[PDB]
Amino acid sequence: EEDASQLIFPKEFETAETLLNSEVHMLLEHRKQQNESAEDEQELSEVFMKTLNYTARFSRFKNRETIASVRSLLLQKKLHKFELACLANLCPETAEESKALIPSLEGRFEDEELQQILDDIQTKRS
Amino acid sequence: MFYHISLEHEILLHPRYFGPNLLNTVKQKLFTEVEGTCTGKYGFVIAVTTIDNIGAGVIQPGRGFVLYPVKYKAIVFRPFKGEVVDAVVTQVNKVGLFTEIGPMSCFISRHSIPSEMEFDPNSNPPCYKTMDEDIVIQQDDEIRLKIVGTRVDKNDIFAIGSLMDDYLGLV
Amino acid sequence: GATPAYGAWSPSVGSGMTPGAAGFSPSAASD
Amino acid sequence: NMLTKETPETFYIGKLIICNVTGIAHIGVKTRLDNGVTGFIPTKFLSDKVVKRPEERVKVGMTVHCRIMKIDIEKFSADLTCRTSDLMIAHPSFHNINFKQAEKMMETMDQGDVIIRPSSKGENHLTVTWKVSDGIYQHVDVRATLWINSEEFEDLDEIVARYVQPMASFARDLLNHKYYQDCSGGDRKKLEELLIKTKKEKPTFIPYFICACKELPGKFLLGYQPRGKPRIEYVTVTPEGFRYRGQIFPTVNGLFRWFKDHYQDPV
Amino acid sequence: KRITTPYMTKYERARVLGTRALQIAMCAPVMVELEGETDPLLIAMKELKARKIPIIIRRYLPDGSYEDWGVDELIISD
């Protein structure tokens, strides 16, 4: 039953807080900054490493202020919380690419309404 | 997907760890207990960000241990089926393609591959080009996918990707 | 151990009752 | 290389090859090595040719590590060196010691030199012994509980120059006081008997003195006789100043300037 | 607004001493100077007289509430 395409999420995960791929990179980097210092401390696992490079390959932006911006303009609309990260990491070019990839965007908004937001993202992409 | 939830844990503490750096030791024993694990309820837990509070430690009657119900705020990574993610291409084989989504890897058979991306074992790099050799999709390419089925294997998630939807390639 | 905490100690002040007059030595400067 | 399976190209000069001497022909130690190479230790390996063998330099029956100086596993020899040398104003002391034996080395330095020694109570602790007076030393058992971090243990130069050097500079001023004594270590029986003998020669002018404890180092004794009853007031020396009636003085002079106008109350 | 008795009942003294002596025998750092003894019940009793046992007592009340009282807060009886 669990399909995020039809937006069905468990109760433990409905109230959860989504995160962006560029967003969590700064947290992981900060934790790496903390653990790389403070000696007589354990070194970081390889799982930490395999997620560092992972979100590093998909950093659409590296500014701290750029992150809250792209979400401020999204939460102003009437989108789901689940749509918040998948539509902020992939950064599709056309709104047809977005609606074809995400089935919940089809019929959810107007095409040009969607595309203006999409262009905002490509403008924010560094 | 990377999320941010407040999780809880109750840890036991041996009486030799009482004394001045007690709560610091509770922190230590939490950092190195619930980091980098995975579950069939919350999924893969990346790292813990902060520790909300330490409960009061109830001395176990009979034994010397005292357990400490601590709630923490960590970032967890739970993929759902049908989510459309980016990943990097790890291994190109006639049996299927291997990718890696952060801490969890997936695999794509030629059944999920339409016949355009043909095999290329004659080349030194195994890639999946097409008939006129313009779209070259080889190892180490940020190739999107769609998780069409999840699987956790003894505290280890293993989903399965596909290539049937359009705009699943190079950006 | 044989050498416990020395400076974490609490200096108890001693109370008294001596209703004397004022015939003592003056103060000085701080430089 | 076909039977023993160990040639001279694997074993090199400079690397330590463990040579197990199991017997000796005449004066040497001819045994086997780890690779079956017949390790024949010569008389230069034991350092004795007409006297007893190198039993102190090569373990007879066991394996003895030596610096490999000959690759002769096919020649039934092993140039393995039996010697260990063949295989290869406010001072701050160090210690890589106990408390009784440390008391005998810290009596010969001057006033201000601070020693560094491991603790003896617990784990990952360090005790800062700094010189106070003649025979008085404060063993700051940090965790005198001075709570610190965990980044500072790599550099042991600032925990003294921020917490003990100002403490030693504040403690040295009371030693050079105009009315200082020792009373054989700051004994409580010897200090009450001095104020009652100094008050008789001058009943009008009342004197004051200053002394420290030997069993509780870091606390000074400020005794005063406002009337025919001796009275003792304590004071603590701090890394930032002094602790007198709970008021912290930045400089050493403000304590006396605050006391000259505070001891005239009836209490 | 703690309303319970301010005295350590005799059951709390038995359980606090037995528990503190178990923690001491499992090598827990003592709060008091040992004048040179080694039994953990003698040590736990010495610590109780110095009011240095690091334990608080959660006194459930019958309605469901509870009150925590440090051990150094209430008046030891024997």
D139 vs C contacts (CB less than 8 Å): 3, 6
Run of H or E residues at A115: helix A111-124
Provide the residue type at A102 as one letter.
I
> B2-13 and E66-70: which strand pairing?
unpaired
Distance in angstroms (rounded) separating the CA atoms of residues D74 and A59: 62
* DSSP annotation of D232: E
| Long-range pairs, D65-70, Cβ under 8 A, ≥24 | D65/D16, D65/D17, D65/D18, D65/D19, D66/D16, D66/D17, D66/D18, D66/D19, D66/D41, D67/D14, D67/D15, D67/D16, D67/D17, D68/D11, D68/D12, D68/D13, D68/D14, D68/D15, D68/D16, D68/D17, D69/D13, D70/D13
Are residues B52 and B131 both part of a single domain?
no
Three-class DSSP category at D258: helix
Side-chain half-sphere exposure of B29, counting CA atoms within 13 A: 18
* Residue ending a domain, choose from B35, B53, B80: B80
What ranges in chain D are assigned the alpha helix state H?
43-46, 158-161, 165-175, 183-186, 188-198, 253-259
B64 closest CB neighbour out of E23, E54, E68:
E23
- Give the Cα separation of A1 and D79 in Å (integer): 75
Q: How many CB pairs below 8 A link A and D? A: 8
d(CA A54, CA D77): 57
Residues forming a β-bridge with B75: B4, B47
Name which of D260, D69, D251 is nearest D173 in CA terms.
D251
Min Cα distance B56 → chain E (Å) is 10
The answer to whether B51 and B8 are in contact (CB under 8 A) is no
Kindly provide the resolution of this structure in angstroms, with one decimal.
3.1
Query: In the PDB record, what is the listed experimental method?
Result: cryo-EM
Q: Using CA of residue D157, residue D159, residue D164, residue D166, what is the dihedral sign?
A: positive
Q: Do B14 and E26 touch (CB under 8 A)?
A: yes
End-to-end Cα spacing for chain C: 44
Nearest Cα neighbor of D256 from D244, D264, D267 is: D244
Helix axes A65-75, A111-124, angle to 10 degrees: 170
Residue D55 DSSP class? T
Residues 6+ apart with CB under 8 A from B47: A28, A31, A48, B35, B36, B74, B75
Would you call B101 an interface residue with chain A, using a CB distance cutoff of 8 Å?
A: yes
Please report all neighbours of B, defined by 3+ CB atom pairs within 8 A.
A, E
Q: What is residue D117's three-state secondary structure?
A: strand
Q: Which residues make beta-bridge pairs with D227?
A: D229
Q: Which H or E run includes D227?
A: strand D219-227
Length of chain B: 171
Of B29, B21, B18, which is closest to residue E55 (Cα–Cα)?
B18
Beta carbons of D230 and D223 less than 8 angstroms apart: yes
Of B4, B144, B167, the CB nearest to A17: B4
Q: How far apart are CA A125 and CA B5, in angstroms?
A: 27
Q: Which two tokens stand for residue D20?
A: 């197990």
Instruction: State residue A9 phi and psi, 5-degree precision.
Output: -135, 145
Range of the domain at B165: 81-171
Contact residues, chain D, for C8 at CB < 8 Å: 144-145
Residues B7 and B71 in one domain: yes
B13, B45, B80: which is the final residue of a domain? B80
Q: B82, B90, B83, B77: which is closest to B142 by C-alpha?
A: B90
Claim to verify: residue B89 and residue B16 sit in the same structural domain: no
Q: Domain span at residue E45?
A: 1-78
Q: Which of B80, B112, B147 is the last residue in one of the domains? A: B80
What are the distances in angstroms from CA D241 to CA D113, D248, D254?
Answer: 19, 6, 10
Convert D21-55 to b/e letters by CB count within 10 Å (16 or more is b). beebeeebbbbbbeeebbbbbbbbbbebeeeebbe
> Are B106 and B128 in a shared domain?
yes
Rounded Cα–Cα distance for residues B138 and B121 (Å):
11
Token pair of D85 as six digits: 């040398």
Contacts of D221 (CB under 8 A, 6+ apart): D186, D191, D210, D211, D212, D213, D232, D233, D234
Asked whether B and A share 3 or more beta-carbon pairs under 8 angstroms, the answer is yes
Domain count, chain E: 1
Residue D186, phi-psi category: left (phi > 0), alpha (psi -120 to 50), beta (remainder): left
Query: CB of B102 within 8 Å of any CB in chain A?
Result: yes
What gap in Å lies between CA D160 and CA B24, rounded to an integer?
25
- Same domain for B75 and B96, yes or no, is no
| Number of C-beta neighbours around residue A2 at 10 A | 12
* E abuts A (3+ Cβ pairs < 8 Å): no
Q: Are B47 and B88 found together in one domain?
A: no
Which strand (E) or helix (H) includes residue A25? helix A21-36
Alpha carbon distance A42, A38 (integer Å) = 9
Within 10 Å of residue B167's Cβ, how many Cβ atoms?
17
What distance lies between CA D207 and its chain's CA centroid?
Answer: 40
Query: Across the strands, what pairs with D138?
Result: D130
Break chain A into its structural domains and give their ranges: 1-126
What is the rounded distance in angstroms from the CA atom of residue D78 to the CA atom of residue D71?
7
Closest by Cα among B84, B18, B79 to B44: B79
Q: Is D195 strand, coil or helix?
A: helix
Instruction: List b or e across D245-267, with b for residues whose CB sees 16 or more CB atoms inside 10 angstroms.
Output: eeeebeebeebbbbbeeebeeee
Question: What pairs with residue D30 in β-bridges?
Answer: D23, D40
Kind of pairing between the strands at E66-70 and D219-227: unpaired
Of B19, B61, B64, the CB nearest to E26: B64
Q: Residues, chain E, total?
A: 78
Chains near A with 3+ CB pairs less than 8 A apart are: B, D
Question: Does residue B7 share a domain with residue B73?
Answer: yes
Cβ partners under 8 Å of residue B91, min gap 6:
B97, B98, B139
The number of distinct structural domains making up chain B is 2
Could you give phi then psi for residue D247, rounded to 5 degrees?
-115, 130
Comparing CA positions, the residue from D98, D137, D103 lying closest to residue D121 is D98
Neighbours of E53 (CB within 10 A): 22
Residue B73 contacts by C-beta under 8 Å, 6 or more apart in sequence?
Answer: B4, B5, B6, B7, B48, B49, B50, B51, B52
| Residues contacting residue D215 through CB under 8 Å, at least 6 positions apart | none
